Amino acid sequence: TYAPLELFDTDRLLDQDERDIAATVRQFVDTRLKPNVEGWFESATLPSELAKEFGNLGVLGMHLQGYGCAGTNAVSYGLACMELEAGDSGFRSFVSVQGSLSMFSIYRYGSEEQKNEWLPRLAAGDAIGCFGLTEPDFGSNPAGMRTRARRDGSDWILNGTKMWITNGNLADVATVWAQTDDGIRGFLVPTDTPGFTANEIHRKLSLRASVTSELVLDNVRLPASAQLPLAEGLSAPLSCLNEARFGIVFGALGAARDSLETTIAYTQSREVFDKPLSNYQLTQEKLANMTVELGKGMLLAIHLGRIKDAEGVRPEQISLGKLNNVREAIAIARECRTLLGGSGITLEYSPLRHANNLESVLTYEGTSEMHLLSIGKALTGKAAFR
Amino acid sequence: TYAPLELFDTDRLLDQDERDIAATVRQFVDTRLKPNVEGWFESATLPSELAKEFGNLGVLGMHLQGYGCAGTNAVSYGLACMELEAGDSGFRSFVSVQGSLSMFSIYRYGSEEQKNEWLPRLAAGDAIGCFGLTEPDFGSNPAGMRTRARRDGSDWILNGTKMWITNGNLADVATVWAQTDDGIRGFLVPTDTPGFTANEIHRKLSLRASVTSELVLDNVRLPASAQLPLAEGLSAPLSCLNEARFGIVFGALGAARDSLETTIAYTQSREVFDKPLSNYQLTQEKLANMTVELGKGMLLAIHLGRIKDAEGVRPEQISLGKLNNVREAIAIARECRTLLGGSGITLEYSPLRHANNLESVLTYEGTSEMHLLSIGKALTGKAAFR
Amino acid sequence: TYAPLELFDTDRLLDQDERDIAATVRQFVDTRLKPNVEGWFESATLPSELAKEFGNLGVLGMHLQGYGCAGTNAVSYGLACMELEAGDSGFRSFVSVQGSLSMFSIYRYGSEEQKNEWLPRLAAGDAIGCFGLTEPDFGSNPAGMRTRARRDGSDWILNGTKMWITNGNLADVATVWAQTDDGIRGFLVPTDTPGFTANEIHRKLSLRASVTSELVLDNVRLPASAQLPLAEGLSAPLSCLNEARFGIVFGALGAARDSLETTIAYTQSREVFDKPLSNYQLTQEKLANMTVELGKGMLLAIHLGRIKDAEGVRPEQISLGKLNNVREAIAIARECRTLLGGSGITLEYSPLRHANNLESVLTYEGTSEMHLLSIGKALTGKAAFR
Amino acid sequence: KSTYAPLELFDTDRLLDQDERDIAATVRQFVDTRLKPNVEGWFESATLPSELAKEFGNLGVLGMHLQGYGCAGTNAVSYGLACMELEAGDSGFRSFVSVQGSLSMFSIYRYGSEEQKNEWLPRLAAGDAIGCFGLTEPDFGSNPAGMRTRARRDGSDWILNGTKMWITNGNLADVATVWAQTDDGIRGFLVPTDTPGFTANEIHRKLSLRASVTSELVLDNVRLPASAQLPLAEGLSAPLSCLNEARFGIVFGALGAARDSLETTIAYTQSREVFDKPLSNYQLTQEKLANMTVELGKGMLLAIHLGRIKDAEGVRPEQISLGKLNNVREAIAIARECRTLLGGSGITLEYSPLRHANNLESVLTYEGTSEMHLLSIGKALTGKAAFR
Numbered sequence A, B, C: 001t002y003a004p005l006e007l008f009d010t011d012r013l014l015d016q017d018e019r020d021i022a023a024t025v026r027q028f029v030d031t032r033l034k035p036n037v038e039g040w041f042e043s044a045t046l047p048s049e050l051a052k053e054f055g056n057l058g059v060l061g062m063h064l065q066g067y068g069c070a071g072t073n074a075v076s077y078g079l080a081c082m083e084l085e086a087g088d089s090g091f092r093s094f095v096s097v098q099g100s101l102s103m104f105s106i107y108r109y110g111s112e113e114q115k116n117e118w119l120p121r122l123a124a125g126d127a128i129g130c131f132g133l134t135e136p137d138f139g140s141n142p143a144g145m146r147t148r149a150r151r152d153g154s155d156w157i158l159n160g161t162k163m164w165i166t167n168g169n170l171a172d173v174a175t176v177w178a179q180t181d182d183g184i185r186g187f188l189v190p191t192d193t194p195g196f197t198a199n200e201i202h203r204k205l206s207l208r209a210s211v212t213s214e215l216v217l218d219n220v221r222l223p224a225s226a227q228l229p230l231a232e233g234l235s236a237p238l239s240c241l242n243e244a245r246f247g248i249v250f251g252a253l254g255a256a257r258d259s260l261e262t263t264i265a266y267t268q269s270r271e272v273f274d275k276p277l278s279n280y281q282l283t284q285e286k287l288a289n290m291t292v293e294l295g296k297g298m299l300l301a302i303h304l305g306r307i308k309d310a311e312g313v314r315p316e317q318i319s320l321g322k323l324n325n326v327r328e329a330i331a332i333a334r335e336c337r338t339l340l341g342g343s344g345i346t347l348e349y350s351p352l353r354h355a356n357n358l359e360s361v362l363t364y365e366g367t368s369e370m371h372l373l374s375i376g377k378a379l380t381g382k383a384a385f386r
Numbered sequence D: 001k002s003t004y005a006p007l008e009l010f011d012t013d014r015l016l017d018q019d020e021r022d023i024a025a026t027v028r029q030f031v032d033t034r035l036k037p038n039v040e041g042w043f044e045s046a047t048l049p050s051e052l053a054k055e056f057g058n059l060g061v062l063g064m065h066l067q068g069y070g071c072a073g074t075n076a077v078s079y080g081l082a083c084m085e086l087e088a089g090d091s092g093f094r095s096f097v098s099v100q101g102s103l104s105m106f107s108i109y110r111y112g113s114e115e116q117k118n119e120w121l122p123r124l125a126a127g128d129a130i131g132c133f134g135l136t137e138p139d140f141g142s143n144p145a146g147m148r149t150r151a152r153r154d155g156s157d158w159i160l161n162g163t164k165m166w167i168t169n170g171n172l173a174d175v176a177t178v179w180a181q182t183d184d185g186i187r188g189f190l191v192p193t194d195t196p197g198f199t200a201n202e203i204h205r206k207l208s209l210r211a212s213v214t215s216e217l218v219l220d221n222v223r224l225p226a227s228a229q230l231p232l233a234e235g236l237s238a239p240l241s242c243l244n245e246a247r248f249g250i251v252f253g254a255l256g257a258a259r260d261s262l263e264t265t266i267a268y269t270q271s272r273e274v275f276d277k278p279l280s281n282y283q284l285t286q287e288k289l290a291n292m293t294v295e296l297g298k299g300m301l302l303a304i305h306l307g308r309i310k311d312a313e314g315v316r317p318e319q320i321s322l323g324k325l326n327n328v329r330e331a332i333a334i335a336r337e338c339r340t341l342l343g344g345s346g347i348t349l350e351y352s353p354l355r356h357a358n359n360l361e362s363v364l365t366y367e368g369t370s371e372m373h374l375l376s377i378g379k380a381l382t383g384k385a386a387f388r
């Protein structure tokens, strides 16, 4: 017999170092995270202590060069994301935010002082970052954001609210995007600055094993040096999103794979009408169709990773993978749950948890519809968002 | 503008008393249950005190005659289930179990003594019933059940485990189905009988606002009089399931309607890219497609109810409704959630809760695949379960 | 065993006169049309003499009163359309055009003299009508039409081109819609009028057993009396479309039923791997899913017909049926073909022919997307066509 | 750059070398200049002229992945790209080539004697002779193990009796590879089509693959010498090995029909105005275009992946099933969806989508139905066969 991706033979597309990274992260997930995940999800906690475990593993800022970062290629970051999310999307979300959003914002747009202050600590998981773009009234359309930075002498004064901010209540530093007299700018906000409050969001059905927050900035005063000096316009936060989105292209496949392998095993173990469930045509149809989507998504992820490591990948190319792999992953998790029957309604087997988590992954970092329309613009030359 | 079912004009198919029942139950849901459902779901409880509230409302055993039961037609019972499930599937599940499973088992197969002892209290919600058919190893195939009742003189001794039993930990009496030397039989088990233990199931992601239990029967000794005297073979429990399934055909539509109406209101209020979300083609596509399925399902529910009242409805006819209305309802809830964006991931707006709940509804009272194959058998004359 | 609609028991929703009409038309189709349809499709012909057979049967203008028309209710007209299309969509298309487009245009908007000139012959099939609305450049948006009718004294002169006009080359009289200085108006154009040319369309893959034409109007001069006196604005042609669309709501279900019943019979007779094809789960899944859509569509059609016969049916209500029933019918025809294997690629068994014909039905009388957006506007109050 | 073609957006050309891209371009230009001007008439009239055999032979596509005998000796990825371009023309063009190379020639190349190879392969490669492959019977298609055509020994000679059905090129062929049951199991025979007792009857009134010859073969007391047996073919494995070669071509070919449909339709949406703007400007249109592009590109990545495995250690049947199941069913969905965007104009032979969709009905069914490939994948994942 073959595992779903073994049937496709996606491993032939990876070198030994890449395969070793995947195996290493998978082992970490199996030993350190999997035994605790059901309780973390039920209780709606993801302990701050995991930051150091992820730091020590090497995954925080792993695609970045220097500052104690691993300095891997893009494919390797993707595989790590895939393995984290196979554990739980909350694990991958923590890492997406730390590396591709927080650390990348500083790496790409920061001063030397900012890079030297924060990057080693963030790489080690000794500090935690967050990325405040979305607001209650603006998610898909961040160009409309209302958070505002005004100058007071050489200082800045920030006022606004950000919403749905992963790690907001855990962070030491927030990368906050705000309108200014000269256009959108980014600021590093120490989270102990007076006027800065993070309020944790509870009663989530998705991403319970994750910290998600409202950030309220009430006359937050910062020095001139707090601005990320190179970030100008919406292109700056969007560049960070394109790094994180790349990780999600791989990550969603991990949730899908974990669901599907767990469910194939269940079908072998469960007898219905005196035969294993895996013996019936209806079961095999589902397993085959799900396998076909998972393998196509893995081929697409690796393809995009190879482009990224060569000349770079364009946003509309990332959109192929973000649109496809998240929507096909949530379909796989949901279909798997049907094969588990009653046993599938609890936290015992991963599919329903994965499906719930993937609701957030479908929406964040650009909704399916935003990516759909980005592809449509690339094919036609006509923007149809408005 | 039209509400989805208003566009179909399904009200024209209903008489005044039926429409009044729907309105009465909807007002009860809105006032007594909706203010509390978010907390009930989060904390995984459905208070036992609701038994008396449902009893006083008149919905427990409402389609039965006598014993303080309402004696309504089948369409009215359907509409009540639709309105209860629009609140939450846990509300409708409580009522399905109390009336169509527990009370119906006693009404149809019980002695006069059993009916007089239990039916008035169950109708009033002064006692709670449960129905123990499913076992850890046998759900879709109850013919294979291994709970056993053996004779000891004129007494019976029951041994087995039932699983996924709604209201198990709240019930005063359990209808327990068991194999015997002469075939499947049913027994009324007072829940304080020595050897009978109910263990509540926790860490559910679906039907959290509902009590679901394991029942362990360890040499439970009963008198001859505890047997349901008229129940012989699998036909007896299945007749109860067909009563309950009928209610679910309507119930699932309630969860779908509540999701859809909530979501339409959200799309009218939420502005994206300077216009209400409801203005966009992609939004209207979703709203129209969902409306089309909801109305078709409503026509099918009413059609089946009219058949049931006029002449009885066959199991394979119920299967049309149970297969269709549950799977289309869960699709509607899921698609609604996408339109809500990030706000849809919490308990604030009903779609994600309804989607999760409908995972159980899809599986219980015969999975989609069971109803699919029952329809296949009716069309071809060939059973394809084995 | 049950036929698909027998399992639903849609016959219970009809009276005996209605059921008798369905049976009469089915017998006519089976005896007079079916033995010839494969040759007609292959040769791309539909003999003009069939007009008289349809006329004698009573289906031409059957829902109209007087003028030798049958004067049936709307449900009966729907059932006749269903049975005609079960034969072939080209048969139903002939009847849709003759009755609901041509004759209804004259009946509803025509003068006393026009009605007496044409309605009795059109009802008998001794004359043939057509309906010229669509232009090469304007189909979904007939408000944009450019055929123009101008005055010259009391005469009218029409100039423009109509396209995809069913029966154009066969018609004695054409109802032609044109823009004027005062808005859209309608005209009865005898097809021997100087300047009026019909050119037949060939190399169709859909609706080969049907005549479809280009109409070229080169300054066609008519008397004042040729105007349909009561037709003003786009509402007039659309009212005719709404009559024809209603018949299509039923008609598409006939193509679906014919495909499905033919395919069920094939699966019972075809042995694969030593058992009838109907015995396999994959087969039964398809048969069951297709049955579910066919029956839901039938319930919707009958519901719309009862509304139509009472206070009248609104366009957006018709859109529910036209959107749903055509797109579900083409899916049934296509899925059926897969079950036939190689034998399904020829004209021997109806599915592939039906699927091809339904391509036209999906597009004409308002595309799926037009009906979709019509429903969206009803739900939201916002038009999203532009 | 303001716009990208669907596969340009994926950048699948970066996965191909110059020689491979040159082959695609060469076959595309042949299809555009020689075949496309005639395809509408050929489909309507239900003809595919036999002269095309020599034209395909001269082009180099007949037996292109085979070595020797005047064959091109290309890699498998190049054969795939040629099939993609032929099918973008019409599936009947690709079907001709599938049968000639991967079924007829390959049967002889793999299982034949030296004498058979020398007699037939050079002519077949050149398109100076035409071959066909008779596996399917009226009663047995998805289950060829159940075939009833029989070969019985008469001394040193053979006598064959049976009927084959749905045989591409049957009425044009000079030689038929005919699969038959024997006392010792399934065997293969080269049957010259002028052998007394061998008759080919052409199938008419097709709605799919009208620009292709499809036949019934009837064998009544067909006598053959011992030398007519393919000596190395034993059991169902032999015909299935031929199918696995042809199926690989189809994994690519179906994408050609999809691409041709989709690019034709994107161009139409750019030029067609509805409600005062190009049809391409609307969200509903862009939704369709994007979803179809996503499937086309995923399919192309899968095809190239399978080709690279084939040119390395080799592709297993269940891996080919991934491609055949996926790419054909997604291609037919693309062609159908494209047709909706064309409106009325899409119902004729003018624009390719409806013709492609009809042709793909055959492609979905032949060389193993979607359900056969689905269940082969299921068996690979579970270790349980669910055919019976």
Ligand SMILES: Cc1cc2c(cc1C)N(C[C@H](O)[C@H](O)[C@H](O)COP(=O)(O)OP(=O)(O)OC[C@H]1O[C@@H](n3cnc4c(N)ncnc43)[C@H](O)[C@@H]1O)c1[nH]c(=O)[nH]c(=O)c1N2
Residues within 6 Å of the ligand: A097, A131, A132, A133, A134, A136, A137, A138, A139, A140, A141, A163, A164, A165, A166, A167, A206, A207, A212, A360, A363, A364, A365, A366, A367, A368, A369, A370, A384, A385, A386, B270, B272, B273, B277, B280, B282, B283, B338, B339, B340, B341, B342, B343, B345
């Ligand atoms: C758990 C979790 C965690 C995070 C985040 C979300 C969640 C749920 N996000 C926020 C996330 O990026 C945000 O939810 C998405 O951008 C979507 O925006 P809204 O939720 O406002 O939906 P919004 O209101 O924009 O969209 C609602 C619906 O409208 C549709 N739509 C929008 N525009 C349309 C158009 N023009 N045409 C048609 N349809 C259109 C959308 O596709 C969607 O279906 C975030 N943010 C952040 O800054 N930092 C973070 O760390 C995180 N993390």
Ligand SMILES: Cc1cc2c(cc1C)N(C[C@H](O)[C@H](O)[C@H](O)COP(=O)(O)OP(=O)(O)OC[C@H]1O[C@@H](n3cnc4c(N)ncnc43)[C@H](O)[C@@H]1O)c1[nH]c(=O)[nH]c(=O)c1N2
Residues within 6 Å of the ligand: A270, A272, A273, A277, A280, A282, A283, A338, A339, A340, A341, A342, A343, A345, B097, B131, B132, B133, B134, B136, B137, B138, B139, B140, B141, B163, B164, B165, B166, B167, B206, B207, B212, B360, B363, B364, B365, B366, B367, B368, B369, B370, B384, B385, B386
């Ligand atoms: C919250 C909740 C509440 C309740 C219940 C469940 C849940 C989740 N049920 C139990 C319920 O009826 C049961 O879950 C279903 O019958 C399905 O059985 P299993 O969960 O054992 O799945 P099972 O293991 O039977 O099926 C697993 C999967 O295999 C598929 N399958 C099964 N047979 C097949 C075949 N022959 N061919 C192909 N596929 C096949 C199924 O469709 C499903 O997808 C119950 N029970 C009870 O007695 N009293 C109660 O009050 C309740 N309430």
Ligand SMILES: Cc1cc2c(cc1C)N(C[C@H](O)[C@H](O)[C@H](O)COP(=O)(O)OP(=O)(O)OC[C@H]1O[C@@H](n3cnc4c(N)ncnc43)[C@H](O)[C@@H]1O)c1[nH]c(=O)[nH]c(=O)c1N2
Residues within 6 Å of the ligand: C097, C131, C132, C133, C134, C136, C137, C138, C139, C140, C141, C163, C164, C165, C166, C167, C206, C207, C212, C360, C363, C364, C365, C366, C367, C368, C369, C370, C384, C385, C386, D272, D274, D275, D279, D282, D284, D285, D340, D341, D342, D343, D344, D345, D347
């Ligand atoms: C065989 C046959 C027979 C007939 C007819 C057609 C055919 C094929 N019709 C013509 C028919 O009514 C016409 O084809 C449809 O109205 C669709 O118009 P177009 O073909 O111009 O497509 P058009 O160019 O309008 O539309 C093309 C595509 O764009 C989509 N689209 C259009 N507007 C859009 C928007 N605002 N947003 C998003 N998408 C949009 C459509 O849904 C479609 O998918 C006819 N006519 C007649 O007058 N008399 C007759 O007898 C017949 N009979």
Ligand SMILES: Cc1cc2c(cc1C)N(C[C@H](O)[C@H](O)[C@H](O)COP(=O)(O)OP(=O)(O)OC[C@H]1O[C@@H](n3cnc4c(N)ncnc43)[C@H](O)[C@@H]1O)c1[nH]c(=O)[nH]c(=O)c1N2
Residues within 6 Å of the ligand: C270, C272, C273, C277, C280, C282, C283, C338, C339, C340, C341, C342, C343, C345, D099, D133, D134, D135, D136, D138, D139, D140, D141, D142, D143, D165, D166, D167, D168, D169, D208, D209, D214, D362, D365, D366, D367, D368, D369, D370, D371, D372, D386, D387, D388
């Ligand atoms: C135009 C064209 C051209 C060719 C061919 C076909 C056509 C249409 N073929 C024949 C082709 O290979 C054949 O049609 C397929 O193998 C399918 O077999 P049947 O048509 O007998 O369907 P069959 O009767 O086997 O199958 C009918 C349906 O049942 C399903 N089914 C079968 N077994 C099942 C099971 N166990 N469980 C569930 N479902 C099952 C199938 O998937 C299908 O949906 C051929 N042949 C050849 O030898 N040489 C050639 O050149 C060609 N060329």
